[PDB]
Scaffold this active site. Structure first.
Site, PDB file in Angstrom:
ATOM      1  N   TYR A 133       0.835  -1.188   0.000  1.00  0.00           N
ATOM      2  CA  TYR A 133       0.000   0.000   0.000  1.00  0.00           C
ATOM      3  C   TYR A 133       0.879   1.250   0.000  1.00  0.00           C
ATOM      4  O   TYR A 133       1.877   1.328   0.721  1.00  0.00           O
ATOM      5  CB  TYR A 133      -0.918   0.007   1.224  1.00  0.00           C
ATOM      6  CG  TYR A 133      -1.524   1.360   1.504  1.00  0.00           C
ATOM      7  CD1 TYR A 133      -2.674   1.777   0.849  1.00  0.00           C
ATOM      8  CD2 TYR A 133      -0.901   2.254   2.372  1.00  0.00           C
ATOM      9  CE1 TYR A 133      -3.223   3.021   1.098  1.00  0.00           C
ATOM     10  CE2 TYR A 133      -1.421   3.499   2.602  1.00  0.00           C
ATOM     11  CZ  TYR A 133      -2.586   3.882   1.970  1.00  0.00           C
ATOM     12  OH  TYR A 133      -3.107   5.130   2.224  1.00  0.00           O
ATOM     13  N   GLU A 187       0.247   5.848  -0.645  1.00  0.00           N
ATOM     14  CA  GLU A 187      -0.820   6.807  -0.344  1.00  0.00           C
ATOM     15  C   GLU A 187      -1.630   7.193  -1.574  1.00  0.00           C
ATOM     16  O   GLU A 187      -2.816   7.531  -1.454  1.00  0.00           O
ATOM     17  CB  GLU A 187      -0.231   8.069   0.292  1.00  0.00           C
ATOM     18  N   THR A 242      -2.915   4.951 -21.770  1.00  0.00           N
ATOM     19  CA  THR A 242      -2.841   3.602 -21.276  1.00  0.00           C
ATOM     20  C   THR A 242      -1.518   3.032 -21.786  1.00  0.00           C
ATOM     21  O   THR A 242      -0.977   3.509 -22.785  1.00  0.00           O
ATOM     22  CB  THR A 242      -4.071   2.841 -21.771  1.00  0.00           C
ATOM     23  OG1 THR A 242      -4.640   2.074 -20.697  1.00  0.00           O
ATOM     24  CG2 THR A 242      -3.742   1.979 -22.952  1.00  0.00           C
ATOM     25  N   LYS A 263      -0.614  -0.804 -25.066  1.00  0.00           N
ATOM     26  CA  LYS A 263      -0.945  -0.904 -26.492  1.00  0.00           C
ATOM     27  C   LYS A 263       0.337  -0.917 -27.274  1.00  0.00           C
ATOM     28  O   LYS A 263       1.092  -1.867 -27.150  1.00  0.00           O
ATOM     29  CB  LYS A 263      -1.864   0.220 -26.896  1.00  0.00           C
ATOM     30  CG  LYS A 263      -3.172   0.059 -26.108  1.00  0.00           C
ATOM     31  CD  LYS A 263      -4.220   1.101 -26.558  1.00  0.00           C
ATOM     32  CE  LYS A 263      -5.578   0.796 -25.893  1.00  0.00           C
ATOM     33  NZ  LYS A 263      -6.306   2.049 -25.614  1.00  0.00           N
ATOM     34  N   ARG A 290      -0.856  -3.157 -18.371  1.00  0.00           N
ATOM     35  CA  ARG A 290      -2.107  -2.412 -18.369  1.00  0.00           C
ATOM     36  C   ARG A 290      -2.052  -1.472 -17.180  1.00  0.00           C
ATOM     37  O   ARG A 290      -2.140  -1.914 -16.021  1.00  0.00           O
ATOM     38  CB  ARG A 290      -3.279  -3.388 -18.308  1.00  0.00           C
ATOM     39  CG  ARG A 290      -3.311  -4.267 -19.549  1.00  0.00           C
ATOM     40  CD  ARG A 290      -4.595  -5.077 -19.717  1.00  0.00           C
ATOM     41  NE  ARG A 290      -4.601  -5.630 -21.064  1.00  0.00           N
ATOM     42  CZ  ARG A 290      -5.450  -5.294 -22.019  1.00  0.00           C
ATOM     43  NH1 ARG A 290      -6.453  -4.442 -21.795  1.00  0.00           N
ATOM     44  NH2 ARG A 290      -5.292  -5.817 -23.231  1.00  0.00           N
ATOM     45  N   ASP A 318      -5.186  11.918 -25.655  1.00  0.00           N
ATOM     46  CA  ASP A 318      -5.165  10.555 -25.142  1.00  0.00           C
ATOM     47  C   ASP A 318      -4.453   9.725 -26.215  1.00  0.00           C
ATOM     48  O   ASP A 318      -5.067   9.278 -27.176  1.00  0.00           O
ATOM     49  CB  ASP A 318      -6.577  10.057 -24.843  1.00  0.00           C
ATOM     50  CG  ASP A 318      -6.606   8.633 -24.320  1.00  0.00           C
ATOM     51  OD1 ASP A 318      -5.547   7.970 -24.269  1.00  0.00           O
ATOM     52  OD2 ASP A 318      -7.689   8.181 -23.899  1.00  0.00           O
TER      53      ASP A 318
END
Lengths: 454, 452, 451, 451
Positions: free
Chosen positions: A61, A63, A226, A229, A235, A200
């Site tokens: 974990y 923040e 992303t 690709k 991913r 994008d």
């Protein structure tokens, strides 16, 4: 009564803990290297990435803010994230004084929405290509479209629509556009209507990093992506944002205010922490993306898409814009009287994976008239232009077969489907596709070690 | 000039492709099994989940709608997602006629926002515990309900009175630092009185829920969301459960009303999934949900609760004060205000001693510390080990108070007694000697790069 | 054929052009004379106001911003300039610290333009019993504060606590049925603690405010709205008052800060006046505001308050319960729950007896709201309002009887309301009583139905 | 003590308020001694004015459509019910097909209550020359459609493509300066192909519509709103018509009734704080009775013939009209071919008692809007509107001279208006020409400021 030993539940391989899931992954491994994978948004990533992805990093974990502590429980995560950040700036040839990047979003779509949340108020107006996303629910969206004749973005109508509609944000980028982007003109339109300009680049980020297409960074305020690709990563999501002095248009000594707003918007979307294994894996992919080998891959992806498109057009098929300048070709099937769904369905039965896709002039979005074909994934398997011409011939046979079934049985899906059962021509095509696919290596896993062999 | 062969870039292991990242992961691997990990939101998942996560599933695009094709390109992922769904319903003892589950969200937070998008319009009113920042507060109208300012329990009367005044379309239960169980029955009565949907974010305690060691939200809530890596011990991923079939007898309700969540939730998730879901998350999650349904996982869940209880009993035996004076779940909320210490001071000192906790608000700078049992329990620790953890916590706060009594309560002044401090180094060393005694899931301590 | 000449359609009196409407108005003139009008929002305005309302001012277009030109708008601008200055004068406001916009059609659109000018859509608003789902609850985010459910006074501690938790951008004060004055100072302290603007909708008590017979909202509020036909006794029209000039010393406020309401309110009003304001309302309001500044109006305002008290003291002496046990303004809220009677039953029985009241919710509405302004304007004083007290006592006594002989269900109770001699006697007693008082606004000597 | 009731309340305006009396008398003169070409103005009837200025202004009603006809609301409900039935009758509407709500204070709030009834906040709206600053653009997502930049007619093809891309929930038709009729058939086509409700704000031509002198929006629109004082020649008030009964054949439509009535009534009611303006409803009932008269039909036809004839006159002098003429009550005068701003013409006309409105032509306003309804109510006919044409021609001529002799910037240009005998000469002819005609609403013989 007592707990299972740690070694039993916690260290036993997938193959023993969950044979069903293991068996399905093995079947999916074989699928990936025994067919022709032309989904334009897919790639086959490296074993190195997959190893960083499936690591103890999934336990950590943090923040949701850019790490800087570099000590304590976050010492190594912060260093990994620092590496991801710098390798990202480096992969896209960005000066850290003018550009910053957040690598914490889970994926491209939450990255986009965090960016919209950072810079826009709810209901603000947005324009994008063919723009039901949260984009269209929580903001006022209006699409710009391609020129009806050329298939290129209609930049004059874009400017007229933006002046009439007054968007606070104009989005560049598409999923099925086979050409480059005039970011300079987009900047001009955005400057004439007071809009932010965001790209994008999910689909062509690898071509962008390799400087094989125009850089949106030259003219855009924000660039999201992303990473799986053409970038060939995990991913994962990223948000680039301008830093420092604004060009003049505007109060004196204006600096970009993106950094804190984007960090806070991402931070507030990251309940329970980021996927630190994705950041680690993304760092690996960003290193691999900065290599000379990756520049050559990106040139081959473009060359491969061009060569497939030349093969198809030479048989008399119609490509939207009559070719491609990127990783994909958009194939208009209306001149054949075929629907994208029919070609996609019959391709799938032969282990060729494409996407039906809308083409300009389609009546209903329920029946797209084209298919979208991308080169990244099979290029990563080592295919070059000649192999992509064989893929063209496989596609030519599939569409030819699709015309024959339709003409024989009918255009209604119920009738079209009758020709798909015990069709020897389909079975022959499928067998040829598998023999061809089996000729190539496969990144990400050893084919030699697969459960399901030839 | 030409492409690297697949072998070179694509099958080379990480240790050679990227030694820097490989090294940092190995150091992080050591940190995880050589310290005391009390972050309440952390777990250590199984090697099997990690092998599913890190597999060719990361390459597979799928549309982002629940798969039903079972043929062609999606043949195997449809089967995987199908197992994930069915295992999800089984792990939480749900009947498919009454409950559906969507396993496509990237994570808990976009799972929650997709749930809200499905059933609410923009600006609809929402209440949650300490709900303000977040997209929830930006796109919807949110009002927090709160804990009683003296008991630390949820004030159910004031919640009802706020709900009746505010008229939320959605009431959210679940929280990150509440050490007690939830009266979902009461929440349902409050929601029925004001016409609200009732949603539980069971992220922290979903492991205990599936093991039926805490109250089941499913008895009373219309929608239950979860992140799957906390008490559930899975990958980082999200799920949305939702009611299906006949709505319960409710006055004025149209006859034969059925729940209408499925299509709305499926479309909202799908529209949030540009480029497709993380099918490696779904596969890894199907592995975790099978492991959650085991007899060993019920016993894990009881052990988590017992370990938290026993650490709490140790802290209160030393005279420390816990919010609500105990726990009913996986965490303890440690009120540090009677010690004149801030939560950040303890978190910082603990961190320097390889004890990771979280500062947390109690009842503006947070005056408490949240401590979770699921991570250490997963390494096999039992109650007596949590009492040793207790004693380590006791030493850390004793030293924290010593530093503040010698160097000062202000932050910059306090940060002095943290440099070259032999008590800190002694605690750190002792924490490591203690941590090295336990097994560690997910990887093999034996095969590690950075050995003891 | 051809057009009727101007004189036939355009100068013929209403009695000839439209006898049906004429007769209807004359019957309504008679209804207004022959009953006891206790609707707390009604008044009987002056003939002078009515003469300016019904004038050629109704023909004039004006663009809808405060007229500053004084050309084709030469006279409408001067009328409006008088209206504004009389507005300021009537409420004892420095024209350097306060401005006023007199163009809104009515109270509602005045309030909505005020909200539109100072708030963004969905901004949070708190008002008394603020949810009839008005534009205020639809386009903004509203939340009520309420009276103490036991005492009936506004609960100022719950108000503050609610405002700290909800964080309104705007707190509205003013109500329709609250019988006490408002601690505007406390409202300002609450608004300051939470960063809220403070607006008073003084519609009901504006007449008392101008006469300085209740607390002035202007001492503490940023904006003050009002409809003008209630205690102010004017036409039906709206006004928005707003602070202007330098802001007074405030903790955390930049030095030399200024109010910025003026142009936002003006533009918001202008943007809402499609086809122009009602300039006949503006002239008529100018008249009413001149009348409201008179020594006679101050005595009328004192008398309204004396009359409401005297009525309250009477009803309480019969053992009835009033919300807060009294009044400090123009009205009285009668709690009918100790009797088992609904507001609608008492309201309907009174309406059959020519006594017009309103059912009203109290801390099915279980109360009636009764106001003194309209009957006070016919000249009634305390002893006359005690006789109204007696009429009211008789009618509730008669309502309790119908329910006792016929049942607490509506259909069962309406039975007792048929061929009831007691109702007929009460109706005639109210009529003979009401007929003897003077009536502003028209001449009874010229009415069509003088009996 | 209180003033005697008659002293404040029954005295005439001339006694109570000589200042406002004087201003209204001056304004009465300005209306009969100038040329009044405001296309939104009319001169209503005395009979309407008598109902407007009546005791109806005292009556509170709830703001729901009235049905009681007994007790306090007995006669108000009858006035309203006549207003509603006459509204339907004035626009030839089957009461099973159409309903009407007559309580909105005015046109603009009627529109907003309409939108509030059928739209949610932020829903998309399309209208002619709409913005993106009315409450409409503020609380909904508005996008305009425009007229063809070269011809000036609504571009119905670009309207269609814009609506299909934008997907409005509501399309508004009606305009304030469009000099041609409206193809409501096309608008309903466009609305059906994009799922939109179709509302017509017929404010400006509702007079022509009632008299069937232009296309009826009722054939093709779901809702029709209007202000009532324009060509309808009524009081300043508003009206919302909505469809009722069987829905027309639609593809995926259940075998379905219209659902406007209860939503419209609730929205209006929720906008009516303190009750409707019942004197407006009374006055409107008069105006509608007068509208359904055979002479009103002659008036409507005369308004168009006057607009046409003034258009042909100005056009025969070389001037350019947007769309080359008119099919309604106004002509829009494109003054850009002369290098004249609309303001420069409006200003000089105003100095001559010729009141026109500068207006944007197909970015200072490039033309002027001129209407016929007001002067046509004073009895003027075609030969007279050609005389106005000549007055207007002299005004533009004189304006061009000043721009040549002094300049194009207003600062310099303005000097031409001082000590201008030609301007003074024109004003006198204007006034002399005005005095030749009757006037409705008041008797010219009785005014204070005589010739």
């Amino acid at each position: 009564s007592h707990m299972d030993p740690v070694s039993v539940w916690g260290n036993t391989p997938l193959a023993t803990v969950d044979p069903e899931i293991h068996d399905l992954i093995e079947k999916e491994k074989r699928r990936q290297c025994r067919g022709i994978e032309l989904i334009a948004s897919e790639n086959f990533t490296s074993f190195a990435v997959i190893e960083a992805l499936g690591s103890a990093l999934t336990n950590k974990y943090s923040e949701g803010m850019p790490g800087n502590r570099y000590y304590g429980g976050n010492e190594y995560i912060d260093q990994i994230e620092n590496l991801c950040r710098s390798r990202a700036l480096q992969a896209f040839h960005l000066d850290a004084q003018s550009w910053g990047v957040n690598v914490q979003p889970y994926s491209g779509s939450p990255a986009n929405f965090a960016a919209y949340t950072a810079v826009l108020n709810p209901h603000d107006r947005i324009m994008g290509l063919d723009l039901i996303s949260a984009t269209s629910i929580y903001f006022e969206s209006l699409p710009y479209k391609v020129n009806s004749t050329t298939g290129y973005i209609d930049y004059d109508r874009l400017e007229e629509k933006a002046l009439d509609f007054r968007p606070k944000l104009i989005i560049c980028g598409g999923s099925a556009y086979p050409r480059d982007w005039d970011y300079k003109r987009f900047r001009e339109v955005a400057d004439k209507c007071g809009a932010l300009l965001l790209c994008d680049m999910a689909h062509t980020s690898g071509l962008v990093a390799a400087q094989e297409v125009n850089s949106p960074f030259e003219y855009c305020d924000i660039v999201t992506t992303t990473t799986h690709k053409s970038l060939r990563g995990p991913r994962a999501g990223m948000i680039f944002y301008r830093k420092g002095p604004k060009p003049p248009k505007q109060p004196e000594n204006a600096v970009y205010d993106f950094e804190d707003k984007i960090n806070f918007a991402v931070f507030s979307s990251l309940q329970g922490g980021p996927h630190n294994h994705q950041i680690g894996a993304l760092a690996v992919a960003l290193k691999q993306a900065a290599s000379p080998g990756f520049k050559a891959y990106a040139k081959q992806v473009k060359a491969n898409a061009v060569a497939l498109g030349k093969y198809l057009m030479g048989k008399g098929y119609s490509l939207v814009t009559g070719g491609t300048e990127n990783h994909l070709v958009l194939w208009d099937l209306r001149p054949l009287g075929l629907t994208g769904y029919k070609v996609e369905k019959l391709c799938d039965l032969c282990n060729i994976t494409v996407n039906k896709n809308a083409v300009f002039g389609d009546s209903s979005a329920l029946a797209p008239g084209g298919v979208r074909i991308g080169a990244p994934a099979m290029t990563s398997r080592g295919l070059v232009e000649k192999d992509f011409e064989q893929i063209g011939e496989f596609l030519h046979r599939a569409v030819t077969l699709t015309l024959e079934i339709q003409k024989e049985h009918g255009k209604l899906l119920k009738d079209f489907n009758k020709g798909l059962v015990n069709n020897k021509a389909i079975e022959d095509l499928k067998a040829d596709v598998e023999k061809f696919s089996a000729l190539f290596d496969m990144p990400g896993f050893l084919v030699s070690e697969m459960k399901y062999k030839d």
